[PDB]
Symmetry: none
Subunit: 191 residues, 4 copies
């Protein structure tokens, strides 16, 4: 179905990069597929994505070279979740506040509706991490991996729309983290 | 018609997203029309807006589906008030401040002149539609504790009233920021 | 000379709007002319100035109608000063701090090169504020008006330059207020 | 290759400005070229760069006037390092946290990958001395802080414009890492 699926990957890229959620070649995202998952390639302009940039990976056995080193996680996520899409990103604020929480609870109405609760995993990538990210995403739509960015899942049926669902949730996270940070600097200091 | 009005919905969309005032899909914005008010479709990239992403909603009763979930809040503001444009956004700092403040009173000229005092609502529904469509009469912007902020548009032309409401929106945020930096500075140094 | 001059006003207005330094309708900037000065019109979309959005004001008596309500301030500055351009904006962080200080001292090298020292006049756009802004602009290149905004002077011989030069100093003040803000929130909230 | 190489300085200046990493005219950036190095001119709106806003400069001899005031520093860096592009900006949060650090150490994954450790140069006084300090600093590091006067980021790609785009990229990373350090410290100084 290339046409539209493509529209969603190039879109999300340009977006995740315009909002600062990822640098020029960081982060990765994927959708589920008959074989396995369709992912972005390692080390490449994620805002200037083109078709040959995406690469199908199976849940099977050989991880083809050129596919994100974060590919282990995505897979595990697809192997133990029902997730139909996954966006990995680095929302500045969410990441700064992740160093002190085990959980991140949004205060805002939009956040509480979609990101009810965001778990923070402490590593003390790696297969091990893959399993923690995986478990967290079973009953949660996003999670922070301490100082390692966040992960958001998409459960919609249409691969592309799932992707927008994820990227979308990522954006909600950062918004909630920002609101949490402001709300505190104010309550705290000052009077 | 569908030339200057579209451009304005698209612009407010792109800017609102870049300015960090909303999420990919959060928020909504409307204009007063002959039938009632035109609004953004619910569920859709506000930053990649199209003519198809909007539609009219009579003040009557038939709220077509696709219209924002908050049309109920827009309508009631178009019923009991002289509004002509309406932006619903999520200014981060302002929202932050909400939880605490009862009213937002800018300490800055640009603010003090156009957003004299921004009351904070604590609702939830029909209940909130009202709360807002009252406050937006004597006031041009209101804060829904934890949800967001509504900014009023008043120009004759539709497009203008919208950008004006979007204007007041960025002003709302800049005032919250000022308030906030103000506090963090004289209160820790 | 209109041409280049015009481009300058249109440019300063656009950048100022982009940089967040003025809302679409506020602020104002002028350049000195043989007559008096050339200032933006009252209430006009600064980011889309047209050659007809600018009006000439003499240093003497009758201020044409349509002029910015603060032509008084600009004129009081061109009367008592060598200023050859004047930019009036609202740098949010610069204003936020102006409430508690009486002088702003850039901690940064660029700031300590032009904005050497930034005074803060206190109320009590009036003829009083103009007179106060005009003298303060005699030994300093910029000044804050508590609650209001900031004033930056330009001095190049070419009006077009002076403006860019004033617009830019405005840019320099905000960089500084921010450096100040962050420096303080940091050194102050840490150990 | 002018074409594309121009598309780089142009985007960089635009981004550096919109990103908040430079005043309307501060900063300077460049790419190593056959003879010596290509660099931004002096006193030019970095946000509106034209092809005529850049000058060549040999590694030895008469620095043509009009070139960046800090061309000496660039020249030093291309003589004593394998730099291929250099961006000198003014990250705000980063400068603020530099006034009392000696080194800046990113707490975030991404920052730790690229900018392992950013040294903060901080002179007292015993130009080319500083130009030799930045150079030495940038030999083993890809980014360095110059207390109260911004940072320096290096590009190592073979294609020049890719190197420039690369160092600008590092620049954002630095500022994002400083911000993460900050919010991490402010959020902590609460409850």
């Amino acid at each position: 179905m290339r046409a539209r699926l493509y529209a969603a990957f190039r879109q999300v890229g340009e977006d995740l990069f315009a909002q600062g959620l990822i640098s020029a070649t960081a982060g990765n995202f994927s959708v589920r597929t008959k074989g396995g998952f369709l992912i972005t390639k390692s080390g490449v302009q994620k805002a200037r994505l083109t078709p040959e940039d995406l690469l199908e990976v199976p849940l099977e056995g050989p991880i083809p070279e050129g596919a994100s080193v974060e590919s282990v996680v995505h897979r595990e996520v697809y192997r133990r979740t029902g997730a139909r899409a996954l966006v990995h990103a680095h929302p500045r604020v969410a990441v700064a506040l992740s160093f002190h929480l085990s959980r991140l609870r949004p205060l805002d109405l939009e956040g509480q509706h979609y990101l009810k609760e965001v778990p923070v995993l402490a590593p003390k990538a790696t297969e091990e991490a893959a399993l923690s990210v995986a478990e967290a995403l079973r009953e949660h739509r996003a999670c922070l991996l301490r100082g390692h960015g966040a992960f958001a899942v998409g459960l919609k049926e249409a691969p592309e729309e799932a992707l927008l669902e994820a990227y979308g949730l990522m954006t909600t996270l950062e918004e909630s983290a920002q609101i949490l940070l402001y709300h505190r600097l104010w309550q705290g200091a000052g009077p």
